[PDB]
Amino acid sequence: SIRLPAHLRLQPIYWSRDDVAQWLKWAENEFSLRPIDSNTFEMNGKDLLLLTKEDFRYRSPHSGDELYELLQHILKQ
């Protein structure tokens, strides 16, 4: 199981900017990713859903691919 934080179990269209910041922290800790700069994802869930894989990589060269794949996993249900 991915041990998603309780507040992040809402559909991501409803995530706030604070939720997205918590999502980044969860991804980094749960999957032992390299450090992600929270300041490069100052957006809400609707904003996050508009990003392409490349948008993720430009904000996080080291972990952007993983973040996009984790969001895809959540979306696939």
Residue numbers in the entry: 15 to 91
Task: Tell me, in the authors' exact words, what the paper reports.
The introduction of an ionizable residue into either hydrophobic patch yields a monomeric PNT domain as judged by several techniques including equilibrium ultracentrifugation and native gel electrophoresis. Examples include the V112E or V112R mutations that disrupt the EH-surface or the A93D mutation that disrupts the ML-surface. To examine this possibility, a variant with both A93D and V112 E mutations was generated and found to crystallize in 2.8 M sodium acetate at pH 7.0. Its structure was solved to 1.86 Å resolution using molecular replacement. The A93D-V112E-PNT domain crystallized in the space group P6522 with two monomers in the asymmetric unit. Most importantly, the presence of both monomerizing mutations prevented any intermonomer interactions within the crystal lattice via the ML- and EH-surfaces. Rather, nearest neighbor contacts were via alternative interfaces that are not relevant to polymerization of the wild-type PNT domain. Regardless of differing crystallization conditions and mutations, the structure of the A93D-V112E-PNT domain closely resembles those previously determined for other ETV6 PNT domain variants. Most importantly, the local structural features of the ML- (including residue 93) and EH- (including residue 112) surfaces do not differ despite the presence or absence of monomerizing mutations or their association upon heterodimer or polymer formation.
ETV6 is a modular transcriptional repressor of the ETS (E26 transformation specific) family for which head-to-tail polymerization of its PNT (or SAM) domain facilitates cooperative binding to tandem DNA sites by its ETS domain. Unlike the monomeric PNT domains of most ETS factors, the ETV6 PNT domain self-associates in a head-to-tail fashion to form an open-ended, left-handed helical polymer. However, its propensity to form long insoluble polymers via the tight head-to-tail association (KD ∼ nM) of two relatively flat interfaces hinders identification of suitable small molecule inhibitors. These interfaces, termed the ML- and EH-surfaces (mid-loop and end-helix, respectively), lie roughly on opposite sides on the globular PNT domain. Each is composed of a hydrophobic patch encompassed by polar and charged side chains.
